[PDB]
Design a binder for this molecule. Structure first.
Ligand SMILES: Nc1ncnc2c1ncn2[C@@H]1O[C@H](COP(=O)(O)OP(=O)(O)NP(=O)(O)O)[C@@H](O)[C@H]1O
Ligand SMILES: Nc1ncnc2c1ncn2[C@@H]1O[C@H](COP(=O)(O)OP(=O)(O)NP(=O)(O)O)[C@@H](O)[C@H]1O
Ligand SMILES: Cc1cn([C@H]2CC[C@@H](COP(=O)(O)O)O2)c(=O)[nH]c1=O
Ligand SMILES: Cc1cn([C@H]2CC[C@@H](COP(=O)(O)O)O2)c(=O)[nH]c1=O
Ligand SMILES: [Mg+2]
Ligand SMILES: [Mg+2]
Ligand SMILES: [Mg+2]
Lengths: 209, 209
């Protein structure tokens, strides 16, 4: 009985990390085997290049960095497939969607080109998109100092996210991330319990193919 | 008057590195501004991951390593465009073709998927393919100990190379690499002088688009 692959995507400060963490804790408290993953995963060789780039300690050509973000997901595929096959549900804090939306926000990057490297990755059974008015998201304190942490770039990534959501091959679920942390959690949790109960029914798919 | 982008591809031990070196020396002796590049370029962060992988000091998931080889070319695009625009012809010892042929030789890698990351790179004005009977190429001493240095894998990369050569958007030129080092050089050199003289006539193209 395989585990489910559940991804959280969403506007900046939309609550992806808080909800990913709470979701795993709640699933495990309700007797599921669930573990948390995030992207980028900064602990590998690739991830350390990505962390330095996001912190602006290094500059990386735009196509190269896009490919490194994708490679960073592929290096985890063997582990993802193994965990799911063993019945462990995986909750993932950002995935290929963020990859495509962020590079796709830069000038002269087509969505098609941005998606290709991630074609074939493990297909999520559930993709939650935490929706929040960009302005309320900036009221969630203030912008950090990493790359992309500005208003104009975020609006352009949001547009790309909306294009990806026309992709009917994927089980997208909109979440109203403007509610309290606990109210948002309870929405996410019920949609996740549903997905887990149906993921044991059809094999793990392949993304964008 | 832009420089030309000339790539050498070819079967193992076909003579790509020797000819790349001789070609640059001859072009410069004949008053051209020409410089040598190679892929993978093992001096960058990415290139050191690639060198360790090829030497088998490290194992890398197959999709991730394919993307790293491509990223390794994109990190050099800014320099490639700048050099060509300044009138410097660039002689390149392996390029995206080797990227696609080598991963494309592994099971379950489609040529389409393998080409995507390199879509958009600077399009070579001339692609020389050094042809040699795989057996005569093994008579060029013996196999080293790096990855892919075996007979069965080389035949499968050669097949992929032949599929890429049906790509009429590219100026492929077959070279008979079984002749002497000097005879092969003289063939390559004349085809290169021709390409350089025509590359000042149309803008640098984009690969596979
Ligand atoms: N529903 C919520 N209401 C109010 N504040 C929240 C809510 N969810 C999270 N926060 C706070 O807002 C900040 C961002 O939350 P976080 O879960 O880190 O978002 P995130 O989407 O992962 N951000 P990022 O990784 O920067 O895109 C943190 O201080 C959270 O405590
Ligand atoms: N035309 C030739 N005839 C005979 N030996 C040659 C010829 N060209 C190169 N060699 C020798 O064959 C070996 C391989 O040459 P090299 O130029 O390094 O090939 P290469 O294609 O770059 N190999 P690789 O990088 O391993 O695919 C070297 O010892 C060369 O001196
Ligand atoms: C997964 C992924 C992410 N991104 C961006 C989103 C914001 C930043 C991470 O920020 P956090 O580490 O704070 O989640 O990195 C990309 O540009 N491409 C990708 O493939
Ligand atoms: C450019 C490139 C190369 N290759 C392989 C060809 C043989 C080895 C390099 O060997 P040499 O360093 O000895 O040329 O690396 C890939 O697998 N993908 C690529 O994108
Ligand atoms: Mg977060
Ligand atoms: Mg060589
Ligand atoms: Mg396509």
């Amino acid at each position: 009985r395989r585990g489910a692959l559940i991804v959280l995507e969403g506007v900046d400060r939309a609550g992806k990390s808080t909800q990913s963490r709470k979701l795993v804790e709640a699933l495990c408290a309700a007797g599921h085997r669930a573990e948390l993953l995030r992207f980028p995963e900064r602990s590998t060789e690739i991830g350390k290049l990505l962390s330095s780039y996001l912190q602006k300690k290094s500059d990386v050509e735009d196509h190269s960095v896009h490919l490194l973000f994708s490679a960073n997901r592929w290096e985890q595929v063997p582990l993802i497939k193994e965990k799911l096959s063993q019945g462990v549900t995986l909750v993932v804090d950002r995935y290929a969607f963020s990859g495509v939306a962020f590079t796709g926000a830069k000038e002269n990057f087509s969505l098609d080109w941005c998606k290709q490297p991630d074609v074939g990755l493990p297909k999520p059974d559930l993709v939650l998109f935490l929706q929040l008015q960009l302005a309320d998201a900036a009221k969630r304190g203030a912008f950090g100092h990493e790359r992309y942490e500005n208003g104009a770039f975020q609006e352009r990534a949001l547009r790309c996210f909306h294009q990806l959501m026309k992709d009917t091959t994927l089980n997208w679920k909109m979440v109203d991330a403007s509610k309290s942390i606990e109210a948002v959690h309870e929405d996410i949790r019920v949609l996740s319990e549903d997905a887990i109960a149906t993921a044991t029914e059809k094999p793990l798919g392949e993304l964008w193919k």
